[PDB]
DNA sequence: TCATCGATTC
DNA sequence: GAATCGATGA
């Protein structure tokens, strides 16, 4: 029912994902980590996704908060975009440091809206879009390794 | 039963 | 500041 991200040696990570169109945006959904060991490889999987996107010649993405709570309470897609600008930049740092910046933006969301001060979980259900990519085969090669 | 993120530990 | 745990309400 769910696809998974695979590591560099072809081993399945504990990181459920899906490829398709959600709220009019085509890309990769990374499922949330929790409770306990549910999708506990979230951060490792996201580091791999960022590394492979960069290796594939992708420099910028758009990332939306896609939790059931935020989809319900925040109707505006532009408000669900986690980063302030049009795009999030993947180049100019290690995949881990890019990932830390990306996931820091998740801390600005509550169940019902934005916070002024960031706090809490940074391993939420997210939708990652590559502008001009509408094909599952591109995303299949990112999560496969 | 379940994904949610606040809360706690790192 | 960030990884992990686990109380919570649907």
Author numbering: -1 to 143
Paper text:
EcoKMcrA from Escherichia coli restricts CpG methylated or hydroxymethylated DNA, and may act as a barrier against host DNA. We determined the crystal structures of NEco in complex with fully modified DNA containing three variants of the Y5mCGR EcoKMcrA target sequence: C5mCGG, T5mCGA and T5hmCGA. The structures show that monomeric NEco has two separate pockets for (hydroxy)methyl groups on cytosines, reachable without nucleotide flipping, and reveal the mechanistic basis for the Y5(h)mCGR sequence specificity of EcoKMcrA.
The purified NEco was co-crystallized with 10mer dsDNA with the central C5mCGG, T5mCGA and T5hmCGA sequences. The protein potently restricts methylated and hydroxymethylated DNA (from the glucosyltransferase deficient T4gt or T6gt phage), but not glucosyl-hydroxymethylated DNA (from wild-type T4 phage). However, the enzyme is also effective against hydroxymethylated DNA (unless it is further glucosylated). The structure with T5hmCGA DNA readily explains this observation. In both proximal and distal strands, the hydroxymethyl groups are accommodated in the respective pockets and form direct hydrogen bonds with the protein backbone. A hydroxymethyl group is also tolerated in this position, and donates a hydrogen bond to the main chain carbonyl of G34. We also find that NEco has a significant (∼40-fold) preference for fully methylated over fully hydroxymethylated DNA, and intermediate affinity to hybrid methylated/hydroxymethylated DNA. Nevertheless, the remaining affinity to fully hydroxymethylated DNA must be sufficient for restriction. The protein-DNA complexes in the three NEco structures are highly similar (all atom rmsd between 0.3 and 0.9 Å).
